[PDB]
């Protein structure tokens, strides 16, 4: 998951991270929707909705900002 480069697919402009979905599955609630541990003492702990994804099960891909490809504008103007 934590692969350093933005990582286009082999011989393909499409971003590997989301495989062109533009969205990934939450790596905090395991796609479940509810918390699993306590994170901020007394505020976000198991029983209620996930603190990160707010219960939508899906977050934006980190590598590309919904572009679906790496060399665009929302992603790669970090030269």
């Amino acid at each position: 998951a934590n692969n350093n480069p933005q990582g286009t697919k082999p011989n393909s402009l499409v971003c590997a991270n989301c495989e062109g979905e533009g969205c990934v599955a939450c790596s905090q609630c395991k796609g479940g929707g509810v918390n699993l541990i306590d994170h901020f003492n007394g505020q976000f702990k198991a029983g209620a909705l996930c603190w990160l994804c707010r219960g939508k099960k899906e977050v934006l891909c980190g590598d590309c900002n919904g572009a679906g490809f790496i060399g665009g504008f929302l992603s790669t103007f970090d030269e």
Partner: peptide
């Protein structure tokens, strides 16, 4: 893919929804 990317640059810069 290069053609589709040129099409996406000239407008809303995304392939997804």
């Amino acid at each position: 893919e290069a053609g589709a990317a040129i099409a996406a640059e000239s407008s809303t810069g995304t392939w997804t929804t």
